[PDB]
Amino acid sequence: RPDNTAFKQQRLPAWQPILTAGTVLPIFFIIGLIFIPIGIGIFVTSNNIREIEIDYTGTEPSSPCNKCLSPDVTPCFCTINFTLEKSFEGNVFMYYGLSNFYQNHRRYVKSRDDSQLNGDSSALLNPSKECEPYRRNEDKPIAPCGAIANSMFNDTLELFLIGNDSYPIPIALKKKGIAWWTDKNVKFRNPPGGDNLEERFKGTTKPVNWLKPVYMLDSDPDNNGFINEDFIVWMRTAALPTFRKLYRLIERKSDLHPTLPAGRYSLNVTYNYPVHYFDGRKRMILSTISWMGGKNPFLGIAYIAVGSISFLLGVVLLVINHKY
């Protein structure tokens, strides 16, 4: 009387794998023979990357940039000397790093109005309440409201090369293409109506900590307001307190001469960002990016650690299985 179907009688045809030591040990060797060659490749390709960092926050008498730690004059120009003992072959990337800068703080992360930065006419005139401590200035809305835009990195770094002659050779630093493609061309847009930016921002002022308004960050109209590469990069809130963000990029030259030949260099810093208040640190990083990214030994070491422990354990269990 009860329905005699496969499902109702708990008799659906099932693969039903069988597991013994004879069918799981071969997997250990295979998994132990694929994570070892990959790890060797990853570990080696990490060491090929040549990367240097320059700390210039000062805080010590010997530091060349300590002359403008305390507020003395608005423009500081401190120079750092460093030498490259190994040439950088491919295209080189320039980063600036900050320490003890909690960009992942809850109150800091939400301090933005992503509808305003997308080019919404209504939101531009009245920003949201999430950016409240930096919402209105002098009874006028702030065009990039929020703590994220307010604390933008604003000191200039420059690269110089010293040859046989004592004269410095400036290095051309490119600025385009340092932010994600999508958020620059889709997520971050200027307000809709207008021919020139200064007219689109009528009732909106500049952030309190800024010097120049948002509609004059760059001379190019393609990086002027809300689409400035240096601005868009700073919005992407860092995951950890210690982070590095893309500043510029020195493209590889057409000729065979390397991008950064081995020699002495000078770092021209227009010191403007004060971080000694919260015991932070400022760094400049020149790196060459491989197919996997930057210089990180974690992936290489981890595969060797995982690859060997699977092979070492697989052999021992095979040894125990064989004799016993």
Partner: peptide
């Protein structure tokens, strides 16, 4: 993932990842 974000760039293009990619 914490030790993975010590790399300063995970892409061939040199771009950096935020706290939402973490």
């Amino acid at each position: 993932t914490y030790f993975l974000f010590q790399t300063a760039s995970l892409e061939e293009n040199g771009k950096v990842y935020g706290n939402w990619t973490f």
